[PDB]
Amino acid sequence: ASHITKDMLPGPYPKTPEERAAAAKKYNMRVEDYEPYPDDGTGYGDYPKLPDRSQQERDPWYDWDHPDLRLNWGEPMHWDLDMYIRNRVDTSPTPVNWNLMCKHLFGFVAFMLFMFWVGETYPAYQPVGPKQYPYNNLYLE
Amino acid sequence: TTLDPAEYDISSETRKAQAERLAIRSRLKREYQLQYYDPSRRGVIEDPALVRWTYARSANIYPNFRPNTKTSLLGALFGIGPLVFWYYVFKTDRDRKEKLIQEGKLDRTFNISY
Amino acid sequence: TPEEKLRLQQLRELRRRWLKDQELSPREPVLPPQRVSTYRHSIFAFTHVLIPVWIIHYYLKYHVTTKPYTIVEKKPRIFPGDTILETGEV
Amino acid sequence: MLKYIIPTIMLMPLTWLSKNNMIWVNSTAHSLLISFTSLLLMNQFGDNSLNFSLLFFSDSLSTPLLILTMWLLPLMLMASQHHLSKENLTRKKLFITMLISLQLFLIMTFTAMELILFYILFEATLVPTLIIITRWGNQTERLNAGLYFLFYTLAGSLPLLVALIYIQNTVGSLNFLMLQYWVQPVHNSWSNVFMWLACMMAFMVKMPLYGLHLWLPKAHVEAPIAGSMVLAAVLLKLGGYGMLRITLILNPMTDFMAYPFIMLSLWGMIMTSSICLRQTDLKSLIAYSSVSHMALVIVAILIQTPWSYMGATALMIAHGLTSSMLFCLANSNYERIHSRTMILARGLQTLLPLMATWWLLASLTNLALPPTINLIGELFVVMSTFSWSNITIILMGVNMVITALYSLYMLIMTQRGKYTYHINNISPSFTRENALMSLHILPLLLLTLNPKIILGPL
Amino acid sequence: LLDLIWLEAILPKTISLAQMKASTLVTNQKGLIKLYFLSFLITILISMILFNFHE
Amino acid sequence: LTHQQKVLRLYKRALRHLESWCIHRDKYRYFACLLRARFDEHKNEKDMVKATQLLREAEEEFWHGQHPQPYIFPESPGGTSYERYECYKVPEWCLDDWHPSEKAMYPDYFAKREQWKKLRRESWEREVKQLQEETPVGGPRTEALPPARKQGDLPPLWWHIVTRPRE
């Protein structure tokens, strides 16, 4: 039976400094880069004061993270930003954006034109004219 | 792609009094472990971060909501959009098949099943 | 750092002491309790394989006379003509 | 039913007449004795049809359907004793009688012989289920969900009396489905469209659609004590079979307007499966699964032409055992953790290893392991609507792919480490927790041995 | 955001619409018996002209 | 984290990233003192941007070309079989409910099991006597006095003082 600030309310400018943290301590003293200003853009059905989104994100990734359990497994107290998309997702590796795989898949895009050609073994190419003579022209005798 | 993720920045001496943001959580961590360590608890912790999570997500979004913008009326381009389109596929379907089934034949003669 | 000096001295006298406690097996402490209780190769395989032979063969001899499609074994594949027939082939 | 309603009404002057705590062991004892009488006089042959006695029973000839109706009352009393024992004895016995009274109308229903006795029995429910939501439920926002549990089913069902009496005064009498031999055809008009409309739309109120189904994750979310009437609400949703009775005749030839019921139940089919991978509730987790492959059967019926009635006979009982068993899993793991939110259940699979087998085979009935009663009917839905067109396999096949993730999305949530908490949740799965968890797959794979009885006319 | 909003738009409008129109029927009837009975003669005069009531 | 110890967090991993690429042992060992001469450029100086520009150019050529699938020391935050021992997984205190003839085995172990509990059953006349005193108002990391000024028991007794051993 917790009624005092039991959820978010119609924010985000009903004295937003008195939101964090009279309750729902997402910010310490409303200057922590996590004061409840980040109502994305409102008007929609997004989050209001919402101890919620655009706080620092893209991974809880089960780090070394020893000062508490605190990464994803072992319940830090009150730091909820977003959930249900992160038990299977990660941070940035050493390479960067470069979509070389479509260029890597473009290696057969040159040979996709080679799929129109034929594959007879003998004789050799001699690609100069109609002297190759593929099929039957004349009769037996 | 997603992301760079900017794991390094500058310091020395930007915002000297910004420190002890852990003093917010270590006070809660002291309030956590004192609640965690006791000779008789026999139950879960209340943990109001999950209380304020689902109830402000499952409920209290429609009291938040207003149709004062067209980006809230933007769901017309996703719900009813393809729902006309499948019927726009399917109304062109089943009648071109029927005309070849009515006028002319194409099926095998041993099509008992079906 | 001189602060944790008294730390991890009594903890080794508690954690490893609990592990000194955890290392504990008084005279192999299984009771079990109550109660009790190679060359043959006489019935360990005979119960295993030698018994279900007769049951399933009875399930096939009593099957061909009932079902109109028994075993549907294929043709002869014979190049000459042989003694099972009367004619021969070159 | 010669004497099937007759023994079970005598069970009612036995609850408050009895002694103290003997009332549980006595009520379960008598209840299983009727189950043989159900099996015995039924399951007879069988060639069009078994008109049973008279104007009150047609013996459920084409579809048996009635054995499943009688498992549940000697199955939920062992489930409801989890958290009920805190009240006065006279108040607890009333909660026993109202569930028994729920079965008696449904015993006469599903056979019903007629149509004017159908609708009064089609509406004979919703009186005991509503009272269960009001008293002895869970926390608040019950009462609006009780109002959403009304005002839809009653809103759509009232034009049936506009429809049926309009048939009774026009062509013969709807007392007999078997005196429905003369049936005039129905042409396209601007009056006959509404005649088919009121004939159909009330049946979409119970088995849901992509529209008008917001009430369904209210009664299953805000639910009684530990899945008590929620198991009965499974049969309440699948028990809208009466479209099989009605639209088999009585304007069959109006299929020109079948398409917006085909399409809406098809893109809404693939959608509501993925509408719950970011849900945060256990009792809502099975609820949106129970929309999807229950919405599978509707395109098996409005599309006529059997090889579609074959599987649709079996797909009613498909989740009818399965989702009832999943709610038994969800009714458990709540007496030990007093919140139904799934995320708090990290660190399972080690404290309860015995029920961990039961998580495996239950969710193995959604992948469904083709020698079962689940993928034996879904192949016939494939066998029907592919003859409709070649496109229909696409959206219907992804339904077999989304619930592959959506079922194993629950199984992996059991496997975590160090559990952070829980000086409570000690109890290593007592006898009531696992004997009640049985008797679901135990008839289910049993029916997969010779699945001949699970077949319509058809 | 669509399923519990733009399906929560059309039907909870109906309860709010009736509760809007149940508010205009009682709160405008707070006594003033002079204002009651001038409206009953409006009923008895509009019945003459309007319809088949004299024919 | 401070500016001087920011050098130390890079210095260990500067050589740790290199042995991933080497093939011998001396080939890696020859480049230890060889990379040390670059570290011996500015030996001891002020703490200003002259020490930061040595690190501001350590942004490139440290992240640039960094560890193409390195050694991971498999018992680690990453690496294969890092948390593989989970069929056992040490369920400490799963042993409350037994309903005996299953508590028949280990007689002396249970006799010692209730013994340690009195250390936890009687600590809040001492631990909570200093728990209100040692924390000033709401301040930093809340370990107690590591002897607790007479006898430290534990302070973290007993879920940390009897924490989960690995196997």
Side-chain angles (χ1 to χ4, degrees), chain D residues 64-72 74-80 83-85 88-93:
Chain D
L65 186 62
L66 186 62
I67 304 301
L68 188 148
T69 64
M70 297 175 70
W71 288 95
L72 297 176
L75 186 61
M76 296 179 285
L77 295 173
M78 65 187 75
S80 65
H83 189 273
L84 184 63
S85 65
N88 288 319
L89 61 88
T90 62
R91 294 183 293 172
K92 289 171 69 177
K93 291 173 176 65

PDB file of all heavy atoms in Angstrom, chain D residues 64-93, unseen atoms left out:
ATOM      1  N   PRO D  64     -18.536 -34.553 -29.774  1.00  0.00           N
ATOM      2  CA  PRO D  64     -18.796 -34.962 -28.384  1.00  0.00           C
ATOM      3  C   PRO D  64     -18.679 -33.831 -27.379  1.00  0.00           C
ATOM      4  O   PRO D  64     -19.654 -33.516 -26.687  1.00  0.00           O
ATOM      5  CB  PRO D  64     -17.720 -36.025 -28.127  1.00  0.00           C
ATOM      6  CG  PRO D  64     -17.344 -36.514 -29.469  1.00  0.00           C
ATOM      7  CD  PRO D  64     -17.434 -35.323 -30.369  1.00  0.00           C
ATOM      8  N   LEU D  65     -17.475 -33.256 -27.248  1.00  0.00           N
ATOM      9  CA  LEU D  65     -17.202 -31.949 -26.638  1.00  0.00           C
ATOM     10  C   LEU D  65     -17.499 -31.874 -25.134  1.00  0.00           C
ATOM     11  O   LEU D  65     -17.107 -30.916 -24.463  1.00  0.00           O
ATOM     12  CB  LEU D  65     -17.987 -30.874 -27.407  1.00  0.00           C
ATOM     13  CG  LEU D  65     -17.880 -29.366 -27.168  1.00  0.00           C
ATOM     14  CD1 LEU D  65     -16.473 -28.886 -27.459  1.00  0.00           C
ATOM     15  CD2 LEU D  65     -18.882 -28.628 -28.031  1.00  0.00           C
ATOM     16  N   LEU D  66     -18.097 -32.918 -24.571  1.00  0.00           N
ATOM     17  CA  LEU D  66     -18.711 -32.843 -23.261  1.00  0.00           C
ATOM     18  C   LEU D  66     -17.867 -33.496 -22.183  1.00  0.00           C
ATOM     19  O   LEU D  66     -18.075 -33.216 -20.998  1.00  0.00           O
ATOM     20  CB  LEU D  66     -20.099 -33.495 -23.325  1.00  0.00           C
ATOM     21  CG  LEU D  66     -21.078 -33.462 -22.158  1.00  0.00           C
ATOM     22  CD1 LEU D  66     -21.450 -32.031 -21.832  1.00  0.00           C
ATOM     23  CD2 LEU D  66     -22.306 -34.261 -22.513  1.00  0.00           C
ATOM     24  N   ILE D  67     -16.905 -34.330 -22.572  1.00  0.00           N
ATOM     25  CA  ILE D  67     -15.998 -34.937 -21.611  1.00  0.00           C
ATOM     26  C   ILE D  67     -15.119 -33.880 -20.966  1.00  0.00           C
ATOM     27  O   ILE D  67     -14.923 -33.888 -19.745  1.00  0.00           O
ATOM     28  CB  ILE D  67     -15.165 -36.019 -22.313  1.00  0.00           C
ATOM     29  CG1 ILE D  67     -16.100 -37.035 -22.966  1.00  0.00           C
ATOM     30  CG2 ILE D  67     -14.220 -36.690 -21.334  1.00  0.00           C
ATOM     31  CD1 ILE D  67     -17.029 -37.726 -21.994  1.00  0.00           C
ATOM     32  N   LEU D  68     -14.623 -32.928 -21.765  1.00  0.00           N
ATOM     33  CA  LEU D  68     -13.782 -31.845 -21.264  1.00  0.00           C
ATOM     34  C   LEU D  68     -14.529 -30.926 -20.311  1.00  0.00           C
ATOM     35  O   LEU D  68     -13.903 -30.320 -19.435  1.00  0.00           O
ATOM     36  CB  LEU D  68     -13.216 -31.045 -22.444  1.00  0.00           C
ATOM     37  CG  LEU D  68     -12.156 -29.948 -22.251  1.00  0.00           C
ATOM     38  CD1 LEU D  68     -11.263 -29.917 -23.465  1.00  0.00           C
ATOM     39  CD2 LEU D  68     -12.752 -28.555 -22.061  1.00  0.00           C
ATOM     40  N   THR D  69     -15.848 -30.830 -20.450  1.00  0.00           N
ATOM     41  CA  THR D  69     -16.652 -29.983 -19.585  1.00  0.00           C
ATOM     42  C   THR D  69     -16.709 -30.479 -18.151  1.00  0.00           C
ATOM     43  O   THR D  69     -17.108 -29.716 -17.267  1.00  0.00           O
ATOM     44  CB  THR D  69     -18.065 -29.902 -20.136  1.00  0.00           C
ATOM     45  OG1 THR D  69     -18.652 -31.206 -20.099  1.00  0.00           O
ATOM     46  CG2 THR D  69     -18.029 -29.431 -21.570  1.00  0.00           C
ATOM     47  N   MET D  70     -16.325 -31.726 -17.899  1.00  0.00           N
ATOM     48  CA  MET D  70     -16.567 -32.364 -16.621  1.00  0.00           C
ATOM     49  C   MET D  70     -15.295 -32.743 -15.885  1.00  0.00           C
ATOM     50  O   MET D  70     -15.375 -33.212 -14.745  1.00  0.00           O
ATOM     51  CB  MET D  70     -17.443 -33.598 -16.844  1.00  0.00           C
ATOM     52  CG  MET D  70     -18.794 -33.205 -17.404  1.00  0.00           C
ATOM     53  SD  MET D  70     -19.844 -34.581 -17.839  1.00  0.00           S
ATOM     54  CE  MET D  70     -20.224 -35.184 -16.209  1.00  0.00           C
ATOM     55  N   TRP D  71     -14.130 -32.556 -16.503  1.00  0.00           N
ATOM     56  CA  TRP D  71     -12.877 -32.693 -15.772  1.00  0.00           C
ATOM     57  C   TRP D  71     -12.702 -31.597 -14.734  1.00  0.00           C
ATOM     58  O   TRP D  71     -12.160 -31.849 -13.653  1.00  0.00           O
ATOM     59  CB  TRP D  71     -11.697 -32.652 -16.737  1.00  0.00           C
ATOM     60  CG  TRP D  71     -11.542 -33.856 -17.567  1.00  0.00           C
ATOM     61  CD1 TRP D  71     -12.013 -34.047 -18.824  1.00  0.00           C
ATOM     62  CD2 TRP D  71     -10.816 -35.036 -17.223  1.00  0.00           C
ATOM     63  NE1 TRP D  71     -11.656 -35.290 -19.281  1.00  0.00           N
ATOM     64  CE2 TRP D  71     -10.915 -35.917 -18.315  1.00  0.00           C
ATOM     65  CE3 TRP D  71     -10.103 -35.440 -16.091  1.00  0.00           C
ATOM     66  CZ2 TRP D  71     -10.327 -37.175 -18.314  1.00  0.00           C
ATOM     67  CZ3 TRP D  71      -9.521 -36.687 -16.089  1.00  0.00           C
ATOM     68  CH2 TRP D  71      -9.636 -37.543 -17.193  1.00  0.00           C
ATOM     69  N   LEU D  72     -13.163 -30.387 -15.044  1.00  0.00           N
ATOM     70  CA  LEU D  72     -12.636 -29.189 -14.403  1.00  0.00           C
ATOM     71  C   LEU D  72     -13.148 -29.017 -12.980  1.00  0.00           C
ATOM     72  O   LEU D  72     -12.416 -28.528 -12.115  1.00  0.00           O
ATOM     73  CB  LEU D  72     -12.982 -27.964 -15.246  1.00  0.00           C
ATOM     74  CG  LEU D  72     -12.366 -27.950 -16.647  1.00  0.00           C
ATOM     75  CD1 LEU D  72     -12.856 -26.750 -17.436  1.00  0.00           C
ATOM     76  CD2 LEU D  72     -10.857 -27.961 -16.575  1.00  0.00           C
ATOM     77  N   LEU D  73     -14.394 -29.407 -12.720  1.00  0.00           N
ATOM     78  CA  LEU D  73     -14.933 -29.261 -11.370  1.00  0.00           C
ATOM     79  C   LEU D  73     -14.275 -30.195 -10.355  1.00  0.00           C
ATOM     80  O   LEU D  73     -14.054 -29.747  -9.217  1.00  0.00           O
ATOM     81  CB  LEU D  73     -16.461 -29.421 -11.393  1.00  0.00           C
ATOM     82  N   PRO D  74     -13.913 -31.461 -10.669  1.00  0.00           N
ATOM     83  CA  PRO D  74     -12.939 -32.132  -9.796  1.00  0.00           C
ATOM     84  C   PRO D  74     -11.502 -31.853 -10.201  1.00  0.00           C
ATOM     85  O   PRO D  74     -10.672 -32.764 -10.218  1.00  0.00           O
ATOM     86  CB  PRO D  74     -13.272 -33.614  -9.974  1.00  0.00           C
ATOM     87  CG  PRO D  74     -13.818 -33.693 -11.335  1.00  0.00           C
ATOM     88  CD  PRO D  74     -14.582 -32.439 -11.553  1.00  0.00           C
ATOM     89  N   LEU D  75     -11.201 -30.610 -10.551  1.00  0.00           N
ATOM     90  CA  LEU D  75      -9.834 -30.215 -10.857  1.00  0.00           C
ATOM     91  C   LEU D  75      -9.465 -28.855 -10.292  1.00  0.00           C
ATOM     92  O   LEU D  75      -8.276 -28.585 -10.101  1.00  0.00           O
ATOM     93  CB  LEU D  75      -9.626 -30.222 -12.375  1.00  0.00           C
ATOM     94  CG  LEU D  75      -8.277 -29.998 -13.043  1.00  0.00           C
ATOM     95  CD1 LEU D  75      -7.314 -31.080 -12.619  1.00  0.00           C
ATOM     96  CD2 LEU D  75      -8.468 -30.026 -14.536  1.00  0.00           C
ATOM     97  N   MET D  76     -10.433 -27.997  -9.995  1.00  0.00           N
ATOM     98  CA  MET D  76     -10.165 -26.645  -9.535  1.00  0.00           C
ATOM     99  C   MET D  76     -10.320 -26.507  -8.032  1.00  0.00           C
ATOM    100  O   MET D  76      -9.773 -25.570  -7.442  1.00  0.00           O
ATOM    101  CB  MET D  76     -11.114 -25.677 -10.236  1.00  0.00           C
ATOM    102  CG  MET D  76     -10.903 -25.609 -11.727  1.00  0.00           C
ATOM    103  SD  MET D  76     -12.055 -24.487 -12.524  1.00  0.00           S
ATOM    104  CE  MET D  76     -13.552 -25.460 -12.478  1.00  0.00           C
ATOM    105  N   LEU D  77     -11.077 -27.416  -7.415  1.00  0.00           N
ATOM    106  CA  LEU D  77     -11.237 -27.412  -5.966  1.00  0.00           C
ATOM    107  C   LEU D  77      -9.922 -27.706  -5.266  1.00  0.00           C
ATOM    108  O   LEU D  77      -9.629 -27.121  -4.218  1.00  0.00           O
ATOM    109  CB  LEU D  77     -12.291 -28.437  -5.564  1.00  0.00           C
ATOM    110  CG  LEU D  77     -13.690 -28.116  -6.072  1.00  0.00           C
ATOM    111  CD1 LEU D  77     -14.613 -29.270  -5.773  1.00  0.00           C
ATOM    112  CD2 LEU D  77     -14.187 -26.857  -5.413  1.00  0.00           C
ATOM    113  N   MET D  78      -9.113 -28.590  -5.841  1.00  0.00           N
ATOM    114  CA  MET D  78      -7.761 -28.791  -5.353  1.00  0.00           C
ATOM    115  C   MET D  78      -6.862 -27.605  -5.668  1.00  0.00           C
ATOM    116  O   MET D  78      -5.840 -27.428  -5.001  1.00  0.00           O
ATOM    117  CB  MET D  78      -7.187 -30.071  -5.956  1.00  0.00           C
ATOM    118  CG  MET D  78      -7.012 -30.002  -7.460  1.00  0.00           C
ATOM    119  SD  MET D  78      -6.534 -31.553  -8.232  1.00  0.00           S
ATOM    120  CE  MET D  78      -8.096 -32.414  -8.175  1.00  0.00           C
ATOM    121  N   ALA D  79      -7.224 -26.784  -6.654  1.00  0.00           N
ATOM    122  CA  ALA D  79      -6.445 -25.601  -6.981  1.00  0.00           C
ATOM    123  C   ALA D  79      -6.848 -24.395  -6.155  1.00  0.00           C
ATOM    124  O   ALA D  79      -5.983 -23.616  -5.743  1.00  0.00           O
ATOM    125  CB  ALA D  79      -6.587 -25.268  -8.467  1.00  0.00           C
ATOM    126  N   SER D  80      -8.142 -24.235  -5.889  1.00  0.00           N
ATOM    127  CA  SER D  80      -8.635 -23.067  -5.177  1.00  0.00           C
ATOM    128  C   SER D  80      -8.322 -23.096  -3.689  1.00  0.00           C
ATOM    129  O   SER D  80      -8.422 -22.054  -3.036  1.00  0.00           O
ATOM    130  CB  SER D  80     -10.143 -22.935  -5.378  1.00  0.00           C
ATOM    131  OG  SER D  80     -10.823 -24.023  -4.786  1.00  0.00           O
ATOM    132  N   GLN D  81      -7.915 -24.240  -3.143  1.00  0.00           N
ATOM    133  CA  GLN D  81      -7.563 -24.330  -1.733  1.00  0.00           C
ATOM    134  C   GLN D  81      -6.190 -23.748  -1.418  1.00  0.00           C
ATOM    135  O   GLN D  81      -5.746 -23.861  -0.271  1.00  0.00           O
ATOM    136  CB  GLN D  81      -7.618 -25.787  -1.270  1.00  0.00           C
ATOM    137  N   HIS D  82      -5.513 -23.143  -2.399  1.00  0.00           N
ATOM    138  CA  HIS D  82      -4.221 -22.510  -2.157  1.00  0.00           C
ATOM    139  C   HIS D  82      -4.365 -21.299  -1.245  1.00  0.00           C
ATOM    140  O   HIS D  82      -3.818 -21.269  -0.137  1.00  0.00           O
ATOM    141  CB  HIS D  82      -3.584 -22.101  -3.485  1.00  0.00           C
ATOM    142  N   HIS D  83      -5.105 -20.289  -1.692  1.00  0.00           N
ATOM    143  CA  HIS D  83      -5.409 -19.130  -0.863  1.00  0.00           C
ATOM    144  C   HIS D  83      -6.914 -18.904  -0.929  1.00  0.00           C
ATOM    145  O   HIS D  83      -7.409 -18.104  -1.724  1.00  0.00           O
ATOM    146  CB  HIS D  83      -4.630 -17.918  -1.326  1.00  0.00           C
ATOM    147  CG  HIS D  83      -4.714 -16.751  -0.395  1.00  0.00           C
ATOM    148  ND1 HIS D  83      -5.728 -15.820  -0.460  1.00  0.00           N
ATOM    149  CD2 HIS D  83      -3.909 -16.362   0.622  1.00  0.00           C
ATOM    150  CE1 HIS D  83      -5.545 -14.909   0.479  1.00  0.00           C
ATOM    151  NE2 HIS D  83      -4.449 -15.215   1.149  1.00  0.00           N
ATOM    152  N   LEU D  84      -7.643 -19.633  -0.090  1.00  0.00           N
ATOM    153  CA  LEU D  84      -9.054 -19.366   0.135  1.00  0.00           C
ATOM    154  C   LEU D  84      -9.343 -19.478   1.624  1.00  0.00           C
ATOM    155  O   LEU D  84     -10.225 -18.797   2.153  1.00  0.00           O
ATOM    156  CB  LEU D  84      -9.920 -20.335  -0.667  1.00  0.00           C
ATOM    157  CG  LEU D  84     -11.429 -20.120  -0.597  1.00  0.00           C
ATOM    158  CD1 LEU D  84     -11.777 -18.765  -1.175  1.00  0.00           C
ATOM    159  CD2 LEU D  84     -12.163 -21.225  -1.323  1.00  0.00           C
ATOM    160  N   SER D  85      -8.564 -20.312   2.313  1.00  0.00           N
ATOM    161  CA  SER D  85      -8.832 -20.679   3.703  1.00  0.00           C
ATOM    162  C   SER D  85      -8.435 -19.555   4.664  1.00  0.00           C
ATOM    163  O   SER D  85      -7.453 -19.630   5.401  1.00  0.00           O
ATOM    164  CB  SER D  85      -8.115 -21.979   4.042  1.00  0.00           C
ATOM    165  OG  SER D  85      -6.711 -21.811   3.994  1.00  0.00           O
ATOM    166  N   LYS D  86      -9.226 -18.487   4.628  1.00  0.00           N
ATOM    167  CA  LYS D  86      -9.119 -17.421   5.610  1.00  0.00           C
ATOM    168  C   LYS D  86     -10.466 -16.884   6.068  1.00  0.00           C
ATOM    169  O   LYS D  86     -10.485 -15.984   6.911  1.00  0.00           O
ATOM    170  CB  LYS D  86      -8.279 -16.263   5.054  1.00  0.00           C
ATOM    171  N   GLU D  87     -11.583 -17.398   5.559  1.00  0.00           N
ATOM    172  CA  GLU D  87     -12.885 -16.802   5.797  1.00  0.00           C
ATOM    173  C   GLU D  87     -13.755 -17.698   6.676  1.00  0.00           C
ATOM    174  O   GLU D  87     -13.337 -18.764   7.133  1.00  0.00           O
ATOM    175  CB  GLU D  87     -13.581 -16.523   4.468  1.00  0.00           C
ATOM    176  N   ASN D  88     -14.985 -17.242   6.917  1.00  0.00           N
ATOM    177  CA  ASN D  88     -16.007 -18.052   7.566  1.00  0.00           C
ATOM    178  C   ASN D  88     -16.366 -19.246   6.699  1.00  0.00           C
ATOM    179  O   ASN D  88     -16.228 -19.216   5.472  1.00  0.00           O
ATOM    180  CB  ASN D  88     -17.275 -17.237   7.835  1.00  0.00           C
ATOM    181  CG  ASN D  88     -17.101 -16.236   8.950  1.00  0.00           C
ATOM    182  OD1 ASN D  88     -16.486 -16.532   9.972  1.00  0.00           O
ATOM    183  ND2 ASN D  88     -17.656 -15.045   8.767  1.00  0.00           N
ATOM    184  N   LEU D  89     -16.844 -20.304   7.354  1.00  0.00           N
ATOM    185  CA  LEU D  89     -17.163 -21.525   6.628  1.00  0.00           C
ATOM    186  C   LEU D  89     -18.398 -21.356   5.753  1.00  0.00           C
ATOM    187  O   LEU D  89     -18.423 -21.871   4.635  1.00  0.00           O
ATOM    188  CB  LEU D  89     -17.310 -22.691   7.613  1.00  0.00           C
ATOM    189  CG  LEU D  89     -18.350 -22.750   8.740  1.00  0.00           C
ATOM    190  CD1 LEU D  89     -19.686 -23.346   8.301  1.00  0.00           C
ATOM    191  CD2 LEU D  89     -17.787 -23.526   9.919  1.00  0.00           C
ATOM    192  N   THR D  90     -19.408 -20.609   6.222  1.00  0.00           N
ATOM    193  CA  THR D  90     -20.610 -20.398   5.415  1.00  0.00           C
ATOM    194  C   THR D  90     -20.330 -19.532   4.197  1.00  0.00           C
ATOM    195  O   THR D  90     -20.993 -19.688   3.166  1.00  0.00           O
ATOM    196  CB  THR D  90     -21.723 -19.755   6.245  1.00  0.00           C
ATOM    197  OG1 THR D  90     -21.291 -18.473   6.713  1.00  0.00           O
ATOM    198  CG2 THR D  90     -22.098 -20.624   7.428  1.00  0.00           C
ATOM    199  N   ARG D  91     -19.363 -18.622   4.289  1.00  0.00           N
ATOM    200  CA  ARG D  91     -18.984 -17.832   3.129  1.00  0.00           C
ATOM    201  C   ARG D  91     -18.128 -18.610   2.144  1.00  0.00           C
ATOM    202  O   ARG D  91     -18.239 -18.382   0.935  1.00  0.00           O
ATOM    203  CB  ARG D  91     -18.240 -16.565   3.557  1.00  0.00           C
ATOM    204  CG  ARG D  91     -19.100 -15.582   4.325  1.00  0.00           C
ATOM    205  CD  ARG D  91     -18.326 -14.323   4.657  1.00  0.00           C
ATOM    206  NE  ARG D  91     -17.249 -14.563   5.607  1.00  0.00           N
ATOM    207  CZ  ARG D  91     -16.333 -13.656   5.928  1.00  0.00           C
ATOM    208  NH1 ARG D  91     -16.366 -12.457   5.365  1.00  0.00           N
ATOM    209  NH2 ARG D  91     -15.381 -13.946   6.804  1.00  0.00           N
ATOM    210  N   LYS D  92     -17.284 -19.522   2.630  1.00  0.00           N
ATOM    211  CA  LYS D  92     -16.477 -20.333   1.728  1.00  0.00           C
ATOM    212  C   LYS D  92     -17.320 -21.350   0.974  1.00  0.00           C
ATOM    213  O   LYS D  92     -17.023 -21.660  -0.184  1.00  0.00           O
ATOM    214  CB  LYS D  92     -15.378 -21.039   2.510  1.00  0.00           C
ATOM    215  CG  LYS D  92     -14.280 -20.129   3.007  1.00  0.00           C
ATOM    216  CD  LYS D  92     -13.363 -20.894   3.939  1.00  0.00           C
ATOM    217  CE  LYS D  92     -12.562 -21.945   3.186  1.00  0.00           C
ATOM    218  NZ  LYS D  92     -11.597 -22.657   4.070  1.00  0.00           N
ATOM    219  N   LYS D  93     -18.370 -21.876   1.606  1.00  0.00           N
ATOM    220  CA  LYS D  93     -19.213 -22.869   0.951  1.00  0.00           C
ATOM    221  C   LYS D  93     -20.048 -22.258  -0.160  1.00  0.00           C
ATOM    222  O   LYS D  93     -20.376 -22.948  -1.130  1.00  0.00           O
ATOM    223  CB  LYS D  93     -20.109 -23.542   1.983  1.00  0.00           C
ATOM    224  CG  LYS D  93     -19.355 -24.421   2.948  1.00  0.00           C
ATOM    225  CD  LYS D  93     -20.269 -24.909   4.036  1.00  0.00           C
ATOM    226  CE  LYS D  93     -19.558 -25.860   4.961  1.00  0.00           C
ATOM    227  NZ  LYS D  93     -18.468 -25.181   5.698  1.00  0.00           N
TER     228      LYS D  93
END
